[PDB]
Amino acid sequence: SGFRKMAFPSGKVEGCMVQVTCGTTTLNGLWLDDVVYCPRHVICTSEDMLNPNYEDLLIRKSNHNFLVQAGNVQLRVIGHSMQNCVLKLKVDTANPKTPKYKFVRIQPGQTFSVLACYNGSPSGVYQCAMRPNFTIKGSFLNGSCGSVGFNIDYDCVSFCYMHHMELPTGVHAGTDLEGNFYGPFVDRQTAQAAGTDTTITVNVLAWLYAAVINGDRWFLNRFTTTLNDFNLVAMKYNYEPLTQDHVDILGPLSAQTGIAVLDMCASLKELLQNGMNGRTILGSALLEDEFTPFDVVRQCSGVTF
Amino acid sequence: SGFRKMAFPSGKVEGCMVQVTCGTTTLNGLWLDDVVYCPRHVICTSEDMLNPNYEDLLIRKSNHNFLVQAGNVQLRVIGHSMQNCVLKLKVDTANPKTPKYKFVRIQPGQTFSVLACYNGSPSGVYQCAMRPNFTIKGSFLNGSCGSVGFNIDYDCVSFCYMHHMELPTGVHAGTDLEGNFYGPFVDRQTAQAAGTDTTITVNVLAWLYAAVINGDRWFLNRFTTTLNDFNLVAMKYNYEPLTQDHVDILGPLSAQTGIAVLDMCASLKELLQNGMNGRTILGSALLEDEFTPFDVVRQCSGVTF
Numbered sequence A, B: 001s002g003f004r005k006m007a008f009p010s011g012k013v014e015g016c017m018v019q020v021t022c023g024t025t026t027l028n029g030l031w032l033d034d035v036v037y038c039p040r041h042v043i044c045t046s047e048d049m050l051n052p053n054y055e056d057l058l059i060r061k062s063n064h065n066f067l068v069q070a071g072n073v074q075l076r077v078i079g080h081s082m083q084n085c086v087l088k089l090k091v092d093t094a095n096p097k098t099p100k101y102k103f104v105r106i107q108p109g110q111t112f113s114v115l116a117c118y119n120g121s122p123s124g125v126y127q128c129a130m131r132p133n134f135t136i137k138g139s140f141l142n143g144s145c146g147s148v149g150f151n152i153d154y155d156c157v158s159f160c161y162m163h164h165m166e167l168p169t170g171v172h173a174g175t176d177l178e179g180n181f182y183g184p185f186v187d188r189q190t191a192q193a194a195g196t197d198t199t200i201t202v203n204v205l206a207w208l209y210a211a212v213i214n215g216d217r218w219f220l221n222r223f224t225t226t227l228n229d230f231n232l233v234a235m236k237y238n239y240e241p242l243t244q245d246h247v248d249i250l251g252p253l254s255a256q257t258g259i260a261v262l263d264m265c266a267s268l269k270e271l272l273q274n275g276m277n278g279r280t281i282l283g284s285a286l287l288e289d290e291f292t293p294f295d296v297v298r299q300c301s302g303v304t305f
């Protein structure tokens, strides 16, 4: 029993973190096989920042201009290239701690763990979600760039996020490991803003199922709803639409608990229209949306890696 | 910016987790040098789980009865002894991944990371506070016994908790690594009750300082209170009395933000008496008490390990 915002064990990713320095800029890199991946803005000076021409700046750099340090060991850089907003530094040594890995681009609503790092060393690990507005609500200070987000599937680390920037509202933006930003953001010191965010409905439903699994079920009512009628209410409360695919993804949780998805939707509708009236669910006074259906099954089943 | 419940990187502890089986019972052990530490109830059967004579049971066990598995390798058990509620299995191989470590007994109100494990493998990592009533609010299923809690300081892992039990209320109980329970619990198959809990006032204040550091300032007011007047209010709300030692511990955060502790106390008094009027603090609609002052400083200053 209990239900917590749980991160993945971080050891497999800890063994891949290095420091990358170019000029006066130091940030984190990810060392997998004989390649180190990091944000390309490591090559910028403070002036370059406002309007960098990354292609021109990169032409001016040589392999020796990149100082890559894995703990106390300097790695020798033997090639470099840029892929979208990421630099790839080929080094002459493959990382002996490379886990089985993949690069994936995740969809809004999917969760992952972040290993926040500074100067190539880890500070801590936490779980977060890709928001509908393509930002993440992280904990990152200047210097954290190149920290990564990931999921673990058995023994395979799926890297999905690399950190690049903080937006004015204090939320975070970055890329996949091919260097393509999530959202419309760019890696320059310019005016940018997150769009209005919304609540991840399928995840709220998953967390309500977690509550029922844990015996916290005061909010279950005696009604049902249609997907249409539910979505009309969701729109009014800044919730994402629920699709039939979401309904089917929630099937096993609905069967485990005996509460059909559309019946849970009727209970959620009442929670939105009437509020929680000072009550909590799983210790929370708000409806939580950063657990996916699989996060619930994983945690309530004791899945290991 | 951003403030998250952040666990320590778990790799150093992952390298110490093993599976321990005796009879039909499998749980987790902690392998440090040539000793595996685990809950002693692994030796019991259902016939004696109600009140075991552990001294007699241990005499009747053979080293051969303990199956210890570190990943894909069986470790030969060459001796067994008991210290309070912890069994110590001497093995013929010293763990090459043993970190620098200490065993510590933590105080109520302090925090630690839990690496939840099943069958010697990790499921996830999350932060817990030791409650004033000597329970923790974790996420643990049958099979999680022997999972540990810890802090890291530089390169040194301080182990402080080993999991043994879930109470009827769904909170969790265990021992230090010398096998002494936190609180008035015993390692028997019985329903046990904790004493009444309280809110950790110094931690709530620390988290309000964290909110200010992260720009969430709406709850600040221009008023100050005396320590005595603050305690009269907070005790009605089942908050621990704030002592001058607590005020002193908050000194660094008070100096960083320029807000005296007794000024912040007047903001907390108003939050207690009036609520939040629909607003949130660091994304929460409740006052959070599971961050220590040190936890705030660590996260906001980017301490690494």
Ligand SMILES: *[C@H](O)[C@H](Cc1cocn1)NC(=O)[C@H](CC(C)C)NC(=O)c1cc2c(OC)cccc2[nH]1
Binding pocket: A027, A041, A049, A140, A141, A142, A143, A144, A145, A146, A163, A164, A165, A166, A167, A168, A186, A187, A188, A189, A190, A191, B001
């Ligand atoms: C990289 O270590 C750092 C990550 C960070 C900073 O705070 C939290 N995380 N990223 C930057 O510092 C980043 C570098 C750019 C993309 C070249 N810049 C910003 O995040 C940034 C710039 C900026 C501006 O400039 C006009 C205005 C408001 C916010 C803001 N954030």
Ligand SMILES: *[C@H](O)[C@H](Cc1cocn1)NC(=O)[C@H](CC(C)C)NC(=O)c1cc2c(OC)cccc2[nH]1
Binding pocket: A001, B027, B041, B049, B140, B141, B142, B143, B144, B145, B146, B163, B164, B165, B166, B167, B168, B186, B187, B188, B189, B190, B191, B192
């Ligand atoms: C060990 O893996 C397991 C940990 C656990 C279980 O649920 C969450 N975590 N610990 C136990 O199962 C523990 C074994 C004892 C120490 C021998 N028993 C309990 O936690 C327990 C027993 C019990 C009873 O027994 C009648 C009634 C109500 C609650 C309850 N909890």
Ligand SMILES: COc1cccc2[nH]c(C(=O)N[C@@H](CC(C)C)C(N)=O)cc12
Binding pocket: A213, A251, A252, A253, A255, A256, A257, A296, A297, A298, A300, A301
């Ligand atoms: C009638 O129950 C079902 C029907 C169809 C598919 C189902 N899947 C699960 C399923 O995964 N439960 C989890 C356990 C759960 C607490 C998270 C597990 N067994 O690990 C149940 C189920």
Ligand code: NA
Binding pocket: B220, B221, B222, B223, B224, B262, B263, B264, B265, B266, B267
């Ligand atoms: Na005040």
